[PDB]
Amino acid sequence: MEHRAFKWPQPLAGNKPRIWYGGDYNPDQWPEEVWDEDVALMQQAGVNLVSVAIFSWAKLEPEEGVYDFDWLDRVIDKLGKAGIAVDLASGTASPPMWMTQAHPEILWVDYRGDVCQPGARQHWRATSPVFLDYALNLCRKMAEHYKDNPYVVSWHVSNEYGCHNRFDYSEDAERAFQKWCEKKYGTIDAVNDAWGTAFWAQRMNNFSEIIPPRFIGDGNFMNPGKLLDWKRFSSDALLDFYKAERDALLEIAPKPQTTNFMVSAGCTVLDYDKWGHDVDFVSNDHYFSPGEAHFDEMAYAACLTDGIARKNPWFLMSHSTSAVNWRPTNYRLEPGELVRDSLAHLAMGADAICYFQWRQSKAGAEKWHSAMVPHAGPDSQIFRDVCELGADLNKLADEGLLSTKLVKSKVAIVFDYESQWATEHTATPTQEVRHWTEPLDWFRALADNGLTADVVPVRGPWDEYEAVVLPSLAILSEQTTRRVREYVANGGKLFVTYYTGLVDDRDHVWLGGYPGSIRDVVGVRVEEFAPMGTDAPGTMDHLDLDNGTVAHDFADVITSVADTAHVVASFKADKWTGFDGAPAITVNDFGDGKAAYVGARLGREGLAKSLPALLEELGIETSAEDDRGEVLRVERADETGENHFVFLFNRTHDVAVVDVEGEPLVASLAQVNEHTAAIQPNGVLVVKLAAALE
Amino acid sequence: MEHRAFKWPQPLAGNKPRIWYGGDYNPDQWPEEVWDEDVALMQQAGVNLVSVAIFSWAKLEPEEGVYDFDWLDRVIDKLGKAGIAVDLASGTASPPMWMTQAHPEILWVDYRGDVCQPGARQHWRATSPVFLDYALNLCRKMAEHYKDNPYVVSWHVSNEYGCHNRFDYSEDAERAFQKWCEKKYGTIDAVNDAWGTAFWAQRMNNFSEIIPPRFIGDGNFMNPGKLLDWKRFSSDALLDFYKAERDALLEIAPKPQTTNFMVSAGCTVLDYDKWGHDVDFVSNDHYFSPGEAHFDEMAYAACLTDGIARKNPWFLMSHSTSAVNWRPTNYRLEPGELVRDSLAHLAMGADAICYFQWRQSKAGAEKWHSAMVPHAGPDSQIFRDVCELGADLNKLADEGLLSTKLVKSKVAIVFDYESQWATEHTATPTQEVRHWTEPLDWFRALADNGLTADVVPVRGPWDEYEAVVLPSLAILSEQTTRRVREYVANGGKLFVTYYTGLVDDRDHVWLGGYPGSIRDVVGVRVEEFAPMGTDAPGTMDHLDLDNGTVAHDFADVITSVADTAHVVASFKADKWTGFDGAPAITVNDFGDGKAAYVGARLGREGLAKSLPALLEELGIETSAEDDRGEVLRVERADETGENHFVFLFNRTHDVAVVDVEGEPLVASLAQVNEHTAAIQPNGVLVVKLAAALE
Ligand SMILES: CC(=O)N[C@H]1[C@H](O[C@H]2[C@@H](O)[C@@H](CO)O[C@@H](O[C@H]3[C@H](O)[C@@H](O)[C@H](O)O[C@@H]3CO)[C@@H]2O)O[C@H](CO)[C@@H](O)[C@@H]1O[C@@H]1O[C@H](CO)[C@H](O)[C@H](O)[C@H]1O
Ligand SMILES: CC(=O)N[C@H]1[C@H](O[C@H]2[C@@H](O)[C@@H](CO)O[C@@H](O[C@H]3[C@H](O)[C@@H](O)[C@H](O)O[C@@H]3CO)[C@@H]2O)O[C@H](CO)[C@@H](O)[C@@H]1O[C@@H]1O[C@H](CO)[C@H](O)[C@H](O)[C@H]1O
């Protein structure tokens, strides 16, 4: 509750505002003579900001209490003198070897008591008082040294908290988890009650009896209430460390500050919407998913970023020019995708576009990760494309893109980090169902029907939207249950799926029939589930619906439908399953609103096909056109609507022709005409609308 | 050698004998006001026994030397006053947190020296003298308190020994394994000889040099003799703990006592047939396997339970109303299956039918496991079905089912826990072959041919049967070899498969040609094996036989056939494999008997098709009808045969019509006529035969 005031990295003295463009720069990894070439190439590419010193601790503090800043003063001076701004890191992302050799108590400990060693990065415990002292000291030294530097426009505090150190099981974590439980519950009776410890003789007499969820034998079942709280605690322990580092910097050197998130459809290492309350601006690292979901999942993640940002501008701190280096198979980007993907984030509300990283490493663990200047060097398709992007972004700022905001959708898809965590336990109805996939499925299926959804975290203002999707939203607290009931009562249009509202925020089941807190709203009562799969011969692996769709993985057993509701689709099945003729999809009237219930996993394709009848019943208007789905349309506008941009992205492997409605500004793999344009696969067109017209 | 005298939980004062019906009850997990509702619902459902206090240690002994019995006196009083009996637990199944915090030496240790922590259940070492002292103390306190309680009719000692703590590698286990080896072998020379330690420089000078089979590098090969003995020792160490707990209870409070087994086709955590010698009555927990084997594997496991029970009545301590919560995908039961599955166990000789559990948990690790009263509550298909079952079981006891016994089959399928263990080593001909699958395959294939097999442990009286199957029975001791030779000599009909009699009880190979101890009996000599699979391109993955069947995974290389034998089926293969025309299935004459040899894995379907010619040759008579296989017929009768029941179960997804031969008593998804009945998929009919008729 409560965001910090929005702050943004400001232009250097004498510059106009720009879409910030550039990325991580690691000059410490090259001979100094390379730095003049870097700068010349950056000017060519239109680069205007770089992120420096992110893992430079071992250079800045080469041994305890010895500081070496001169190389970085020098780099920062050459950048600034060329008009390139610096987003400066704290430098505290990962500790040097001298530190972990003197203080092995810093290193995080795994569920079995094995100590993560140096050799990669981020091997520190979030609750180490010793690592905290080291970090805050370096933050103070950096702040003191760079506080009156005019080329430094922002702090980049640490890097991707929890990417490697989400979980620690040390004695430090044990003591901190105990204190976090006492602060959250007050008494051990309220912990026993929250975690349901009357089973398996788990009841505790005092706080000292709370241990971390350490090794219990592989395959055995941890207490779910406790594991959910362990995840909340791990997120909060890292957030407290961020806050301390932030506050140490800001007290000496008050500049716009952020830390880079890892928002993507499937990453929930942290409750990023909570974290969004502690940053001045939201910044995000996102790397494409391979294959057919590349475009859609990226637009989704960018959308959720914007939703975390409460529609404020946000900063894309990283993405790749082409391949990453950490998947089993590191696919390259296809032609056009470098520009398209950058513009996808821009469309969804970013006012900074940055890459990991500027110059591709020639040695170390990152050498095979793509860069803005590849091994090949500047004479490459990649660097030319980087240059073209630089020019596109200068153009879009010249035409007024800056501080426009992602337009308000008709539909808010709700997302809850905590509901995901809840669905991750091993003793749920099926390991094939998690929260995270369903909102992405709804985003894509709505796209197929010509509608661009907003993705809104559960804390944010989804109840202001024309329609709302609760997508496998396993947790509904008392508070959220009330928000839902009121939302619908007062004219809302609600879609609710299987695996919604199973439990409260303690992972206590809502009894009486699922979804046990909102049966009245949805007008159905579910008695049990029917998971599906192919784990043994003869298992039930699908259910047909009578609207021509197929359910996989999970279906609800709906045994009553209220009088104020009706059935829109029914399962068709072999008689012995009990599903022949059972209700699959319903719609209910509730006060002035409506709620549809989708009682099974239909996937993108099933939902896409199911949606027309449901959009019609709920009075949600969309384009009628056959080619509706071919292109994702994304809009930004200022509050007045006089600067309005539309970004059009082909989602397909066919040429998409579209009615073009304003002035074309940027075209990648697209040709304009007569208000027509043909967009090649992986193509994008961006248009500025004339405010005096339609 | 030597069973205890059979004892059975007796009716409460003023009741007649009943099929015990109910399950685990955990009132400690609900507010006390719920207990009056539980009791009212139990009466409605026909519930007449519940199992209480199984994991209640942390409530009964909330801290060391403080006892709190009053809540359970109260619950037991309300149950008893409503006519519901209590199967009372020892309460010692899993220790409280205060205990493991004071005494971490209690916790079991894994192969790598990592200590299993509290967080789930049963984290105690079988050979901890300290955990033993705690357990026996609580057993004495419970026995003393409940010894003159008339509503307590049995002891339920601990719960599922070895489900989580089968293996411990602590210093306690090291010392105990040393003593178990000395007690078994007498001298270190006899251990060296048993384990074959002259390879890999493993020879030991004394007992102190025997360590547990701890971590040797993942992928490396433990000594097989030793690992087999480790498994026997782990089973015996838990059995000694059971015996001590039992004897501590019984000395103060002599009531019928059991501990719940985990008999299923594939579970061999313990030598359950040995354990069967130490219980007063056999009790079993069994949860359905998903997909097409659900019915058959359950009938098998129930059958093996009965065989462990030496045809005495046995107690089904647990099974599920619908889904469990511990598989990757927790399928629900289909309509009818709740009643059908319960009656399957009943048919195979159970005189008690109980579920985990009475009321579905609303919190903790078990919340998604089905119950008799689901989250949904009593207004559910599940609770109605539980009520219908209650009524069916009252009816069947009124008609005389109690203490009838599962009829003697023509065929005994032999099962050996130890042979399974032997086949589990990593350096066998193939990891795709284990003992356990073959007896289940034979049970199903015989069912397909209209015969209901008995499953008889190797120690029991299989040599009294008309026919006997040795199914991948890898171990044949000197003693069992002699029993087999005599059995056949004297008129027995024997089926022997691939992977039988490879080794003696020390895992020493019988030399000269497999199966090296009974070549004379089976009239074949095998020189080597041909495992099969798809592990690389071009591997041999099957062999056709000339009776229209296909072998997969394993075939024997038979190189001679005795004069008293002939070949019934031959492989057909590409010439270069060497299998074209080689013998696959033989029959031999040996004294007055016969032995068939099935020299490959044919599966249920191959064996089913192979069986007519083999049943004909061995003079085993079966129904001739085409629809033979559609229904499993299972019979119980008293010694006189004047109370005779027949249970008929559809195995198929078609409607099965059957000739009905007595008075119909219970019908689920079946309709009776003219002595005809039509049984729907998942249906069952139970009939009492008129003793004066056919
Ligand atoms: C944003 C990002 O990807 N950064 C990391 C990368 O992140 C992965 C980890 O957080 C793991 C930990 O659970 O989860 C991955 O997300 C999963 C998600 O958990 C699944 O549910 C879902 O289905 O799939 C996604 C993956 O698609 C995170 O994405 O981890 C790699 C490997 O450690 C890092 O290399 C990467 O950070 C970047 O590394 C670059 C190369 O070394 C640069 O260091 C750059 O500074 C970083 O942004
Ligand atoms: C009878 C039963 O299933 N009880 C346990 C369950 O048992 C499994 C374990 O013993 C593991 C250990 O090896 O083996 C499983 O059997 C395997 C077998 O080993 C394989 O060869 C074969 O192919 O598959 C079977 C599985 O189908 C045992 O079945 O383990 C679960 C998970 O730990 C327990 O939840 C279950 O006990 C019941 O748990 C309920 C829910 O918490 C209640 O506590 C109830 O009291 C228990 O009966």
Residue numbers in the entry:
A (entry chain A), B (entry chain A): 1 to 673, 676 to 696
What text appears in the publication on this structure?
Aim: Bifidobacterium longum subsp. infantis uses a glycoside hydrolase (GH) family 42 β-galactosidase (BiBga42A) for hydrolyzing lacto-N-tetraose (LNT), which is the most abundant core structure of human milk oligosaccharides (HMOs). As such, BiBga42A represents one of the pivotal enzymes underpinning the symbiosis between bifidobacteria and breastfed infants. Glu-160 and Glu-318 in BiBga42A were predicted to be the acid/base catalyst and the nucleophile, respectively, based on previous studies of GH42 enzymes and sequence alignment.
The asymmetric unit of the E318S-LNT crystal contained two molecules (chains A and B) of BiBga42A, and they are virtually the same (Cα RMSD = 0.106 Å). The electron density map of LNT was clearly visible at the active site. The pyranose sugar ring of the Gal moiety in subsite -1 adopts a slightly distorted conformation toward OH5, and the C6 hydroxymethyl group takes a gg rotamer conformation. In addition, the C1 atom was located 4.3 Å from the nearest side chain oxygen atom (Oε1) of the superimposed Glu-318 of WT-GOL, and the configuration was not suitable for the in-line nucleophilic attack to the anomeric carbon. The sugar ring of the GlcNAc in subsite +1 forms a stacking interaction with the side chain of Trp-326. The nitrogen atom of the N-acetyl group is recognized by a direct hydrogen bond with the carboxyl group of Glu-160 (the catalytic acid/base).
